[PDB]
Amino acid sequence: SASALVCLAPGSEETEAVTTIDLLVRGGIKVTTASVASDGNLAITCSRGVKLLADAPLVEVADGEYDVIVLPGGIKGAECFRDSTLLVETVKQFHRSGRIVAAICAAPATVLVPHDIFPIGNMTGFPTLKDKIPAEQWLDKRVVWDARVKLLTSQGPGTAIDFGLKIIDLLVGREKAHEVASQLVMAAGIYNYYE
Amino acid sequence: SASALVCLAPGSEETEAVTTIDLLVRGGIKVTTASVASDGNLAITCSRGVKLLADAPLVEVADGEYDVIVLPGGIKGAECFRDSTLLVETVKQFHRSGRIVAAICAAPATVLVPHDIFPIGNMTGFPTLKDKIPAEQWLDKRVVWDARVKLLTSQGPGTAIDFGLKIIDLLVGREKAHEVASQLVMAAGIYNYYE
């Protein structure tokens, strides 16, 4: 019965968003995609021109029963997220209500830091944006999970598998993470959750 | 400069398709997505439910100036490709005219082998479908490039980066492939075009 809300804005990074969605569905997690900062328009043009159709406007789904809210990166998508009062409030509400916030690539530095959503609490993001993340919070790691604040972060398009697998591990369990990983033909240095 | 025709069908594997498109654009390759939906529909529902929009129906663009035709996997999307006379015709024409055919995951075994498009040449594909590739052609490599017949194949969602980078190497060159790789935060077991 686990579910995820995956946010999409103009300029979101399509590999990050789609890889994550696909893995979550492979993990048996129900995914809803939400259009952010488009006044309800479901057509989203991503950072390298891939066009997606979101399921619903964020304002219609923000109050639902999801276990995780996912913020893909892509600098311009992340800026839309940052500048959306609804997005920011929804992320805060997910946190305060004991749910997971998952953010990749530009999203940590661009969305979470300026709004002080997670002012203590370990976090990563795209490495060339390292300086935008407070020194004491930064870790240069493919995926960072801070259970104290239920914050999952990750670094880039190439870490989207690692990111999605950790969401599965947290929501469904290790066995299912391995089941999913085992069918992807993953590169050798990525953790596969085996026994 | 270089261009790529990326085919899409109902049931295409969205991580494979989108990762490839993203990397090709990062490589400076002009990408056109073509719907192989039998009715010409462009709003494609992929294998895990992601809704992608194709630029054009295949009939309108099959005759274009492209250096490579790319066949994503996904079982039902590859079946659509196999069962499309225009798709098969187009792949044969790319091959006979000295251009590249690139196929990942289910596409080699489902599209290429039944139509005997490559009676000679090394190929890979999704490992659980290995028995569907003639033993004399099968290799268990993340990416297989057979220059003799200009056939590029790859194995799964987790090899989509490897696949896309090799397309860049072939269409643009090693420098650009390395440039793109270096932006991704990719895992250590993916060749990064250094040396």
A105 is catalytic: yes
User: Residue B188's closest chain A neighbor by CA?
Assistant: A189
Q: What share of chain A is helix, strand, coil (3-state, %, to 5)?
A: 35, 20, 45
Resolution given for this structure, in angstroms? 1.1
The b-or-e profile of A164-194 (16+ CB within 10 A means b, else e) is bbbbbbbbbeeebbbbbbeebbbbeebbebe
Q: How far lies A79's CA from each of A88, A110, A124, A131, B106, in Å?
A: 11, 6, 17, 17, 37
Q: How far is CA B108 from the centre of its chain?
A: 9
Is the CB of A157 less than 8 angstroms away from the CB of B50?
no
**8 Å CB contact between A20 and A6:** yes
Whole-angstrom distance, CA of residue B72 vs CA of residue B94: 16
Residues of B annotated catalytic, as ranges: 105
Beta carbons within 8 Å of A147's beta carbon, 6+ residues apart:
none
**Number of C-alpha atoms within 13 angstroms, CB side, residue A176?**
17
**Number of C-alpha atoms within 13 angstroms, CB side, residue A141?**
14
Beta carbons within 8 Å of A148's beta carbon, 6+ residues apart:
A121
Domain boundaries, chain A: 1-195
Is the CB of A159 less than 8 angstroms away from the CB of B185?
yes
Nearest CB to A189 within list B48, B156, B189: B189
Q: What share of chain B is helix, strand, coil (3-state, %, to 5)?
A: 35, 20, 45
B191: left (phi over 0), alpha (psi -120 to 50) or beta: beta
- Among residues A7, A46, A80, A105, the one annotated as catalytic is A105
Closest-CA distance of chain A to residue B50, Å: 7
Which method was used?
X-ray
Beta carbons within 8 Å of B55's beta carbon, 6+ residues apart:
B32, B33, B34, B42, B61
| Cα end-to-end distance, chain A, whole Å | 24
Whole-angstrom distance, CA of residue A57 vs CA of residue B24: 30
Residue among A25, A55, A130, A185 with most chain B CBs within 10 A, to mutate: A185
**8 Å CB contact between A74 and A44:** no
Interface contact A114, partner B, CB < 8 A: no
- Where does chain B have alpha helices with state H? 14-26, 58-61, 75-82, 85-96, 107, 160-171, 174-181
Question: Quick one: which H or E segment has residue A192?
Answer: none
Interface contact B64, partner A, CB < 8 A: no
Whole-angstrom distance, CA of residue B145 vs CA of residue A76: 36
The closest of A150, A135, A160, A171 to A28, measured between CA atoms, is A171
Whole-angstrom distance, CA of residue A73 vs CA of residue A12: 6
Report phi then psi at A76, rounded to 5.
-80, -30
Nearest CB to A25 within list B48, B184, B188: B48
User: Residue A27's closest chain B neighbor by CA?
Assistant: B48
Fold of the domain spanning B1-195: Rossmann fold (3.40.50)
Whole-angstrom distance, CA of residue B91 vs CA of residue B69: 7
